[PDB]
Design a protein around this nucleic acid. Structure first.
Ligand code: WSB
Ligand code: WSB
Ligand code: MG
Ligand code: MG
Ligand code: MG
Ligand code: MG
Ligand code: ZN
Ligand code: ZN
Lengths: 98, 186, 73, 926, 186
RNA sequence: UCAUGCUUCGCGUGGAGAAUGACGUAGCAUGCUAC
RNA sequence: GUAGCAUGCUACGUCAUUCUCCACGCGAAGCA
């Protein structure tokens, strides 16, 4: 009995946009490893289909990735992995449901 | 040194003390002569200490100079030995086969382990027991490394010539194993 | 104390063999080394006293080397 | 129950013996890789609730095909059915039946898996990793079942030993192709999961020994085409078995089938990067972390280890002649040389020198030193060699005759022996008897000790556990300070040692250390930071007194490597030697109360303390290359300020090229060293200490993760285990908080004292009993699966009474004595060792006592603590030495008076035959 | 360090100090005598220290020379001393087999190969004269190393075989000694 | 042929500090001479 | 009162030995 995410992955609200310009307004949910030093966001869940960059409190800009053809089961709300993500973190994002 | 530069004062002091002992002008003049002797002796001791220090420094410097010269001589003598060794092995290379293999290389770079295996003109096989001899080097001509080698000379552990007719299972206990067989590439 | 006397005697005997130039015969030297090492780490005196006889026979085989008459005066 | 047996068979047309009772269950002990929110680890749990029906052949001959029926809850039955209908088409998936059978009045849902072996792959990995000689039934059954050996093969004893019975390697290698087929089938399963969009964790316990996968309890469904097979624990746990069973030996044949002939690789081919990537894609397709075939491109130490693990695995498929220096022709003054301009490491891939000079003009002293040290010109000019006395690769014969080197019997000091026997020694039935001698060897001594390097095998490590263990082990070296130093600051102890081959032809180390100035030495050290200098390490034959007849050899490394390794580890290691109270006790004397302080530091506030110790059987000749590379890497952690990553990598490459897999000149011939470590390099003892600490930490990790987890009644330790699993198999980056926490836990409950390959441990007996810290068996298992060595009871000891001290440490026994209203621990040696030192000597001059009186004073200093022993003969040893010293002084005085008629007895010598001079050596005031 | 020109003088000065303190003379003379005693003591101390240094150097040289002399005597008589020690120890052991073979070798009945230890193996031994033959060889049995060996061949001095019935004091002068006897352990 | 390190013993040489003894140049206490 | 001499203490300069610390040279022993 080996499980993906025994404890649901923590999440919070954040801001993101196509470029580094539309990060002022928070419009997306992000899953982050709870106690990985500070905060480390693994994925971004939003009801948008053009996001390419995300920003978080100093301010740090994180490169996004194109979303697989995903109709996530809570619409066309996609699920954007951070570039360079490993398989285990990809599983937890989906193992913690989406 | 007895005749140090400031020995005149000490000599005068000693002579004056001898004269005073012989004569003894007075107590006050005797005390003055004692003071002069003491100051001259202090100066003489200062000069002697300085001279001894300088002598020690000079001796150490010369010893270091000789040691450095000998070290450079040894360096110049080992440089020639290393050059001679490198240029001896260089003339020992079989240039034709070495060039042939080097050229075939894509970038002129090849593993070291194949230079003897593909260019060496002599093979040495060390055979512990008779079964190994039967398996590998049986006969007067054998095959190894995709090459045909013709046996040239077999010696025993004592480095004594062993005839190929003496290497048999019956004579095996009578031989000084391991046998070293040197063969020439055909 | 006859068990530590054969080991010291074996050491001395192989030392005498070595300086008699028995090391130039690989087979004989190998046999002598085997006997010496077996004597050193032996536990029964009777076995050591047979290996010692073998080693001393090796030494006595070289009649020209040593003069037994003078040494055993 | 007979109706049930006719629906488990279904329509596959089989015949079932109810090995497991039909409607009842089957309970056994099986290894699982479990991770819940409650429990974690890789431990043998109690499998239950399953009914296992065996299958009969056409003839009534039972085969290892089992129908495993299980009762599942409706909600998980539906989920497994809908996750199997998607993977049903993959060949690497065992069949399932998914029926409903009436029990009582309720249609209970049953899931029936068809034609599974008896044991899974988790059982094989657990059996081969947690190996207990007295408990091997699950491994013997696996070996016999798959025709690896015969059931009578285990009547032989030491059949499991890699040294006493080297044929066990063949028996294990008979499992190679089964493991390889399992790897291929798991790659197929991963492809199927990705194409069907299934997300889940692959564990060894869900794959039987035919490769089929059969459990889908915790898999989830996403959009097709984007699935995430999480294979990190699977491969990481399986890694050691891959080299233990030689699973990739089928890659050495044409068409990758064991029936066809081997592959005849091009002899001039040295760059196998394409083949390495092909193998990685074939067997580790879904291993997320990036693989660098050549470790030149690696990002740091943790990335060098990861890629060198795979290179170790993949370098067993390639010809042995392609590894080694890469030679090239360069013209100097119009004369063509043949010099090394690179290297092909079995672990580090292809490395190319950056300062290769073509069409030069002259060779300075540094350049002559570099060209005269590499084996390029030596091997390229010698004649070919085929040495049948050893299995190690033979390169060339430099001379025309082989050299046979013997060992001399040793000299006998008859005067001391006669004196001792006159003092009632060496009588029959005495507790003290001669056991240490000088043993003689025939001509084949060094080449016979090389056949012990034959014991080094390619070992692939569990890389995730290795990385965590490295992070924890690096905390045992935090109080030290190191870095690079100039030539001005290097301290050479003795300059009258040999300089190695070919430098011993012209002088000692002094010649070269005073020939080349500090500028030349700095230039050479800077050169080694961006180029590789292969060197030849001579094989010297020792001449010393020992208790067993082994021809012990050492490695006379060249002078270039010694200089360039000193300018690193001199400053790294003087701090280790100058530190008191650390785990590594190198540099600490046993005199003036040092032994007592060391023991009291080892006993540091351990709660229920027991003592344990060990010694590795063949430390240098059986050490895997991975752990030697690790030891070199953690020693270089101190160069964060003085060296960049490229410089560090090239220093590691130099070390590997001249002390890991160099060319050794043994008796006028060049051989290739399989691996291990060269005892005689600049970091022998310290690298051994690092290796020892790494093995101990690995043992503790395995002990803590192999515990059930539900049985641990302490919450803190249970959480520690749960997080220890995470920090290994679910974290890619080091977690410093938990590394510190685990280091503190180990220091509190597992206190070590390390000196090279010698170790003493004070451990909490209660935790070790409960499995929460390493016992002496968790350390034998680690040596078996990670060292290719079986450690017998003759090398390990335990002590439940710690008022007696360690049984043995550095060949010294401990004794709790009294000296001045205080009880202190004193070290005393084996009396036979001291008596043998007195009786047998190296030179013939040493057999004259009067010339060697300090020689006996040193032995009396060493043997003084025997005066406190309850056994009377042990005290008589020291008294014998004192009386013999007095006799020697009397004889010397007589000789002096007789020959040179002047008396020089003096009064300072009288203190040598008195016990006070030796009492003061073990009293704490200096 | 008595007998030196300084010490004795100092000693007299000390006596001069013993009288003055008992005499109770003027303070100036008392301090003069004290100063003279102090300077004499300093001179004596200087001379004694120099003499002790010279004696130390002489003793060091003497011990070094003794070491050098005895090392050569150890390394030059290694062969004779080791053999004498060997035979002393063999005499001390007093074993029947060792003593028997040593006595036989003394009489000239040396072996030709290593004495076997197996249950049955070959042993070739020289027999210089008929006296040794009758002492050891009786019938087909041969007594050597405190064991019985079955004779299996008696080679003549000319490599010619000899029948066991040809050997006797009546016929011994006719034969050609030494006789090589080959026997197998019983 | 005889490696890398650690520890200790003995002897010898060089340097730096502390205690006792000896001799000039200065500061303090008393006495004697010139005034 | 000033200067010089005598006795007793403190501060600078040179030697006599006596123990510590280090710097190297030689020999030796144990250890991994
Ligand atoms: O919460 C849990 C789950 C499991 N276990 C232990 O772990 C063992 C294996 O549990 P499991 O889910 O792996 C069986 P299952 O999935 O049907 O079959 P396979 O593994 O063969 O695929 C159980 O016996 C039990 O001792 C536990 O303590 N707590
Ligand atoms: O003079 C020595 C002795 C040892 N060593 C190092 O210390 C390790 C262990 O030394 P050891 O006395 O335990 C014999 P080991 O090799 O274990 O073999 P056995 O147990 O079969 O006797 C060696 O590997 C080597 O790296 C060295 O440098 N020099
Ligand atoms: Mg499981
Ligand atoms: Mg199940
Ligand atoms: Mg060991
Ligand atoms: Mg050990
Ligand atoms: Zn890498
Ligand atoms: Zn550095």
């Amino acid at each position: 009995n080996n499980e993906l995410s025994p404890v649901a992955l923590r999440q919070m609200s954040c801001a993101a946009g196509t470029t580094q310009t539309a990060c002022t307004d928070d419009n997306a949910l992000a899953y982050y490893n709870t106690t990985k030093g500070g905060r480390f966001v693994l994925a971004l869940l939003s009801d948008l289909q053009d996001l390419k960059w995300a920003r978080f409190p100093g301010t740090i800009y994180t490169e996004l990735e194109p979303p697989c053809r995903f109709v996530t089961d809570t619409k066309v709300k996609y699920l954007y992995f951070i570039k360079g993500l490993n398989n285990l973190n990809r599983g937890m994002v989906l193992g913690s449901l989406a | 040194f007895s005749s140090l530069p400031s020995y005149a004062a000490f000599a005068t002091a000693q002579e004056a003390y001898e004269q005073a002992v012989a004569n003894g002008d007075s107590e006050v003049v005797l005390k003055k002569l004692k003071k002069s002797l003491n100051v001259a002796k202090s100066e003489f001791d200062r000069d002697a200490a300085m001279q001894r220090k300088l002598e020690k420094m000079a001796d150490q410097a010369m010893t270091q100079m000789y040691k450095q010269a000998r070290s450079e001589d040894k360096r110049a003598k080992v440089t020639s030995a290393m050059q001679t060794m490198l240029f001896t092995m260089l003339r020992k290379l079989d240039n034709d086969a070495l060039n042939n293999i080097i050229n075939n290389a894509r970038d002129g770079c090849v593993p070291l382990n194949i230079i003897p295996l593909t260019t060496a003109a002599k093979l040495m096989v060390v055979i512990p027991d008779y079964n190994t001899y039967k398996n590998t080097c049986d006969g007067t001509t054998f095959t190894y490394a995709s090459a045909l080698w013709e046996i040239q000379q077999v010696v025993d552990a004592d480095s004594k010539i062993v005839q190929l007719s003496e290497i048999s299972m019956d004579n095996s206990p009578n031989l000084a194993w391991p046998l070293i067989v040197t063969a020439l590439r055909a | 104390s006859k068990m530590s006397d054969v080991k010291c005697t074996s050491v001395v005997l192989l030392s005498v063999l070595q300086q008699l130039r028995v090391e130039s015969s690989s087979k004989l030297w190998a046999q002598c080394v085997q006997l010496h090492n077996d004597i050193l780490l032996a536990k029964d005196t009777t076995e050591a006293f047979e290996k010692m006889v073998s080693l001393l026979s090796v030494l006595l085989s070289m009649q020209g080397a040593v003069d037994i008459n003078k040494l055993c005066e | 129950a007979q109706s049930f047996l006719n629906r488990v068979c279904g329509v596959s047309a089989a015949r079932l013996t109810p090995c497991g009772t039909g409607t009842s269950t089957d309970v056994v002990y099986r290894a699982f890789d479990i991770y819940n929110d409650k429990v974690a680890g890789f431990a043998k749990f109690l499998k239950t609730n399953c009914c296992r029906f065996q299958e009969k052949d056409e003839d009534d001959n039972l085969i290892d095909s089992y129908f495993v029926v299980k009762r599942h809850t409706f909600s998980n039955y539906q989920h497994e059915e809908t996750i199997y209908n998607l993977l049903k088409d993959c060949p690497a998936v065992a069949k399932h039946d998914f029926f409903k059978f009436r029990i009582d009045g309720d249609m209970v849902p049953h899931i029936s898996r068809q034609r599974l072996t008896k044991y899974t792959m988790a059982d094989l990995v657990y059996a081969l990793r947690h190996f207990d000689e007295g408990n091997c039934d699950t491994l013997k059954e696996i070996l016999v079942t798959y025709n690896c050996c015969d059931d009578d093969y285990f009547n032989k004893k030491d059949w499991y030993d890699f040294v006493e019975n080297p044929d066990i390697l063949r028996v294990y290698a008979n499992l190679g192709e089964r493991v390889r087929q399992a790897l291929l089938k798991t790659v197929q399963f991963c492809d199927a999961m990705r194409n069907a969009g299934i997300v889940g964790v692959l564990t060894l316990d869900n794959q039987d020994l035919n490769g089929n996968w059969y459990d889908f309890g915790d898999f989830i469904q996403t959009t097709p085409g984007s699935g995430v097979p999480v294979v990190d624990s699977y491969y990481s746990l399986l890694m050691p078995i891959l080299t233990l069973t030689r699973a990739l030996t089928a890659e050495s044949h044409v068409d990758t089938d064991l029936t066809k002939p081997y592959i005849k690789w091009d002899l001039l081919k040295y760059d196998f990067t394409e083949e390495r990537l092909k193998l990685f894609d074939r067997y580790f397709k879904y291993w997320d972390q990036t693989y660098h075939p050549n470790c030149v491109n690696c990002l740091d130490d943790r990335c060098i280890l990861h890629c060198a693990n795979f290179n170790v695995l993949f370098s067993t498929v390639f010809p042995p002649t392609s590894f080694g220096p890469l030679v090239r022709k360069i013209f100097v003054d119009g004369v063509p040389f043949v010099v090394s301009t690179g290297y092909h490491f079995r672990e580090l891939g292809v490395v190319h020198n950056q300062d290769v000079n073509l069409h030069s003009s002259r060779l300075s002293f540094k350049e002559l030193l570099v060209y005269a040290a590499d084996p390029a010109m030596h091997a390229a000019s010698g004649n070919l060699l085929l040495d049948k006395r050893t299995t190690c690769f033979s390169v060339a014969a430099l001379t025309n005759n082989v050299a046979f080197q013997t060992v001399k019997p040793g000299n006998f000091n008859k005067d001391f022996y006669d004196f001792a026997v006159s003092k009632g020694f060496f009588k029959e039935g005495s507790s003290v008897e001669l056991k240490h001698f000088f043993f003689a060897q025939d001509g084949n001594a060094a080449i016979s000790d090389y056949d012990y390097y034959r014991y080094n095998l390619p070992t692939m490590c569990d890389i995730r556990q290795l990385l965590f263990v490295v992070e924890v082990v690096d905390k045992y070296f935090d109080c030290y300070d190191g870095g690079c130093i100039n030539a001005n600051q290097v301290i050479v102890n003795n300059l009258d040692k040999s300089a190695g081959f070919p430098f011993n032809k012209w002088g000692k180390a002094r010649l070269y250390y005073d020939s080349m100035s500090y500028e030349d030495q700095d230039a050479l050290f800077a050169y080694t930071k961006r180029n590789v200098i292969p060197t030849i390490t001579q094989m010297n034959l020792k001449y010393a007194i020992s208790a067993k007849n082994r021809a012990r050899t050492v490695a006379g490394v060249s002078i270039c490597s010694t200089m360039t390794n000193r300018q690193f580890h001199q400053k790294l290691l003087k701090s280790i030697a100058a530190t008191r109270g650390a785990t590594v006790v190198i540099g600490t004397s046993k005199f003036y109360g040092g032994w007592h302080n060391m023991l009291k530091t080892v006993y540091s506030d351990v709660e229920n303390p027991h003592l344990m110790g060990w010694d590795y059987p063949k430390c240098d000749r059986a050490m895997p290359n991975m752990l030697r590379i690790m030891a070199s890497l953690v020693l270089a952690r101190k160069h964060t300020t003085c060296c960049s990553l490229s410089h560090r990598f090239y220093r590691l490459a130099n070390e590997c090229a001249q002390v890991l897999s160099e060319m050794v000149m043994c008796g006028g011939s060049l051989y290739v060293k399989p691996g291990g470590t060269s005892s005689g390099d600049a970091t022998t003892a310290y690298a051994n200490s690092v290796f020892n600490i790494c093995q101990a930490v690995t043992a503790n990790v395995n002990a803590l993760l192999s515990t059930d987890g539900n049985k641990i009644a302490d919450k803190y330790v249970r959480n520690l285990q749960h997080r220890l699993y995470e920090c290994l198999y679910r974290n890619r980056d080091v977690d410093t908080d938990f590394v510190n926490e685990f280091y503190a836990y180990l220091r509190k409950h597992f206190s070590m004292m390390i000196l090279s390959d010698d170790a003493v441990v004070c451990f909490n007996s209660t935790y070790a009993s409960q499995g929460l810290v390493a016992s002496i068996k968790n350390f034998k298992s680690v040596l078996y699966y990670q060292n290719n060595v079986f450690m017998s009871e003759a090398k390990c000891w335990t002590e439940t009474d710690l008022t007696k001290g360690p049984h043995e440490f550095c060949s010294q026994h401990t004794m709790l004595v009294k000296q001045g209203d205080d009880y202190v621990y004193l070290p005393y040696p084996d009396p036979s060792r001291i008596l043998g030192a007195g009786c047998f000597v190296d030179d013939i001059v040493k057999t004259d006592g009067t010339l060697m009186i300090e020689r006996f004073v040193s032995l009396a200093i060493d043997a003084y603590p025997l005066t406190k022993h309850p056994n009377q003969e042990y005290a008589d040893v020291f008294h014998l030495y004192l009386q013999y010293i007095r006799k020697l002084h009397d004889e010397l005085t007589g000789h002096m008076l007789d020959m040179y008629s002047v008396m020089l007895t003096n009064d300072n010598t009288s203190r040598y035959w008195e016990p006070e001079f030796y009492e003061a050596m073990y009293t704490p005031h200096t």
